[PDB]
Amino acid sequence: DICFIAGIGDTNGYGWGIAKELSKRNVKIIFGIWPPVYNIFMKNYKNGKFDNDMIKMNILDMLPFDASFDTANDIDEETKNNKRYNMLQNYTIEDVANLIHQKYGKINMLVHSLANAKEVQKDLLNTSRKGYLDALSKSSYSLISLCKYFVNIMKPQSSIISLTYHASQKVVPGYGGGMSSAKAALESDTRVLAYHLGRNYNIRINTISAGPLKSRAATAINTFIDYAIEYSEKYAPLRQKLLSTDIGSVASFLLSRESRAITGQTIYVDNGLNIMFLPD
Template identity: 55%
Template sequence: GKRAFIAGVADDNGYGWAIAKSLAAAGAEILVGTWVPALNIFESSLRRGKFDESRKLQDGSLMEIAKVYPLDAVYDNLEDVPEDVKTNKRYAGAKNWTVQEVVESVKKDFGTIDILVHSLANGPEVSKPLSETSRKGYLAAISASSYSYISLLKHFLPIINPGGSSLSLTYIASERIIPGYGGGMSSAKAALESDTRVLAFEAGRKKRIRVNTISAGPLGSRAAKAIGF
C-alpha cells in the first residue's frame, strides 16, 4: 500500500480531510500535518469521536489516521522560530513542528512516503485589496501559501519513493480578478502555480516524482468562511 502525508488538516470540513478520505478509501495509510494552534482541538475531537460520522468510507469502515504531526509550515527549522512563538502558550506544548523536524519524525516513524499533499494557505490581510496590502501581509501570504510548499517538497523529497506524487490546491484568482481574494493571496496562488511547473521539472528529473496543483472549486471550509467566500 501507499503512504500519504497530508499537510493542512485541522477539522473535517476542508480539502485536506476530503483528500485524506479518498486516499484512505483507495487503501493508502494516512499521516496528517496539523497547524500547531489547532492541534489540541483536532486531536481531542478525533479522540472523542466527533469526526466518526465523517470518517466513514464507502465500504462502511472508518478512516484511520496513523499519526497526527503538529506542523507550522512557515518555519523550516528551529533557528527560524522567533522567541515569542517559541514561548507562546499554543506552541510551547507541542514539539518538533518545524518542517525539517516533521520530516525527520516521519522518517523515524515510517521511513518513506509515496504521496505528499499540501492543503494549506494563510493570508493575514486577505480581506484587504492588493493595493492596500502591507509588505508584511504580502510576504506572510507568500510564506504560508507558496513557500510552505517548496519547503515541504524540499524536505520530503529524500524520503518520497521514486514514482511518488505531490499535490497542492490553488485558486483561479491567480489568473483572473476575484475581488475579495486580496492580501497577496492572488499573488501567492500565481507563485504556487509557476512553482508547480518548475518543481515538476526538477523533482521529475531527480526522482521521477510528479508535482501537480489542482484549481479548487468552492468548498465551505473554515478558511473559505473566514474570508466570507
Template identity: 35%
Template sequence: MTTERTYPLLEGAKVLVCGIANDQSIAYGCAKAFRELGAELAITYANPKSKAYVEPLADALGASLLLPLDVTRSDELDAVFEQINRTWGRLDVLLHSIAWAPKSDLQGGLLESSAEGFAKAMDVSCHSFVRMARRAAPLMVDGGTMFTMSFHGANKVVEHYNLMGPVKAALEASARYLAHELGPQGIRVHAISPGPLKTRAASGLTDFDELLESASHRAPLRELVDIFDVGYTCAFLATQYARRLSGETLYVDSGVHIMG
C-alpha cells in the first residue's frame, strides 16, 4: 500500500528574481508565477532609470525587497545577497534572466565581433550567473533551485543571433557544471530555453520580427509562447514535484526546437 503524499507548492519560499526591465520581461512572467504559487519575492533593477519601470511591478507583486543590481559590480552583488541574508536568513530560488552585448557586436556577424564586445557579452550574460550562484549557494540551507535563460541559438545556428549563440552555449554548459557541483547540497540548476518572445532585449536582434513569424508557423502547437508560459514552467521546477530534475536545458517553445 502506498502512502499518498501531498506537497505545498511554493508557500513561503524565498525567491530572488533578477532581470525584470518591464512587464514584457521573461523575468516578470516568472516573478508573477512564483508569487501566484505563494513565494515571497526579492526583485532587482539594473539602474536608476530602470527602477521607474520595475518598482510599480514589484509593488503590485508585493515584493519584500527591491534592490539595485548591476551585475558587473561586485559591491552591488554582495549587497543584494547580504540584504537577503539579513531579511530572510535563507534563499530557495534564484532566477537569472540577464543578457547584454554591445549593439555593434550584436548586429554584426560573429566574424565581425570585437574581442571586447564578446568578452563583455560573456561576462554579463554568462559569468554573472556563476557569480550569483556562488553567493546564493550558502543561503540555500535546505537546498534550492537556480534558473538561467537561454535560447535555441545556443545549440543550432539561428540567423541573426550572432555572437549570442556561443555566449548562450557557454551559459548552458555553466548551468550543467553548476548542477554537478551544487547537487550534493541539494541545489538543482536549470537552463530554460524559451521560444522567441517579444521582449526589449530581443528587439536588438536584426530581423527579429521574421524570427517570430517563422517560429509561429513552424511550431507544432502553431502558436508562440508568452512570458507566463516560461514562468509557470520555472515555478513547477522549483517545487518538490520536480525534486529529481537537475542540469536540464528545458525548452518552452511550443515544440519549435524539434523541427528541422
C-alpha cells in the first residue's frame, strides 16, 4: 500500500490529516510538495518541528511537485530559472510519475489535495479570464492530468480521491477567483473520470467535500475562514470541531478496498452543514 499525496505544504491542512490517518493503516506515504514551499517544509522536517504533529508517521519520500506542469516541456524558461525551482528536478506531473515508479514500482493510492487561484480575493463577476483559467488549470485540470499519468503506475484495483467545497453547488460569497467554478468542474470531472477509469482500468475515483479548516490556503482569502468555521460550529447538525483527521479517516476509507463499490461520488465530510437550508 503506497499513497502519493499531491499538495501538502505544512501540518495545518487536509493533506497532513490524510497522511496521518493513512499511516494508521500502515500505508506508505509519498509527499508531493510545491517548490515555493519545498525547502522550508524539508527544513522543518529535519529540525523536528513536525515531530509533535506526527504522533509515528511512515514518510517514504518527499518530492518537489508542481501540478501546473504536465511534462518537462511545459516548464516555461522563467520558472525553470526561478530562484526556488532552480535547483530542483523532475517536478512535473509526468516526471514524478516516472520517478515514483522507478524508486518504488506501482502504487495503489492517489490523493489530489491542492487548489490555487490568483484572484481568489475577487468575486466571480470581477475575475479576469486569465485569473479564472488559472483557477481551473491548477485546481481542476491538474486532477485530470494527475490521473492520466498515474494510471500507468497504478494497479487495479487502485483508488483516487480529491478535495472539493460546497461553493460549487451553493453560493458562498467570498469564495472567488473562479474557485467555485473550479470545484464545480472538478466534481463533474470526478464522474466522467470515474467512468473511464472504472471501465478501462478498474480504478476508482471520488471526491471529498470538506467543511472549513483554518489552513494556509484558507487564510489566503481576504477572517472569511474564521467566520466559516464559527458558522459551521454553530449551525452544523454536529457541533464537534471539524478536524483534518476527520477528513483523513474518510479519505483512508475511500482509498481502501472497503469502498470498492463507490465511485464517481462527492462525499460530504462537514459535520452535516450541507444539509441545512435555514439557519437554526
